[PDB]
Amino acid sequence: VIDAFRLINANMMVLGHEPRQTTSNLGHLNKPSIQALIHGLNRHYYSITINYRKNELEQKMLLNLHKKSWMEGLTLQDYSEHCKHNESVVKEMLELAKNYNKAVEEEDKMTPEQLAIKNVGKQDPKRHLEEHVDVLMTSNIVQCLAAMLDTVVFK
């Protein structure tokens, strides 16, 4: 959120500003917020836009702010917490299975609109699923893939 006002002015009551010939600085932009109309002088102006020609050199220089070391990219984390993390997730999948069984078991004709007014409680059937299993897969598969991306060349 930026603004850069251009001397919001009220000298004369029958003129605005000198140039009024385009709708780019007059209609193309968003109309100002209501409170800025209230406590600001209503003769508002200005059109803040980044307009720095998109300098490609610094753009390519910055780019990723979360790149890591290349030699960090081949890391394996560790195998022990991988396995106990899997064990931890299996019990929550069991409990999600129990909840899912109950929610398919109810199968009420109360209409899904009225199903969505009583879902505010703890009931979360299929409301997790993905959030662990792909987290499972992205735990496993990379741990699988990095298991084999360091073998045939390291002896």
Partner: protein, 111 residues
Amino acid sequence: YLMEGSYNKVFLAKGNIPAESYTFFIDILLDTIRDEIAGCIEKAYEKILFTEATRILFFNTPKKMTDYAKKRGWVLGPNNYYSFASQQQKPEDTTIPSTELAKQVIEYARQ
């Protein structure tokens, strides 16, 4: 009979022939017995004696002492026909043939 692991009463069943000779095919039968007994003994085994590989199958010792070198080799020592070990180590590389097997999530499930 070639699907059963009996391989010698065929020739006495060849002893009675309801046709003219049934020998022109029996020559190819002999051939096939030769290379099947070869390929069955060529795996790991523990050195049968000359006489079992010589007379019990076929060839009442004409040239079987020479046919032994003709087919495979397995040089003779003190009257035994030993089979070399030939057990594969199960090389634990599995990178080339199972990297797509390693990738059996991404290149079938589009995510």
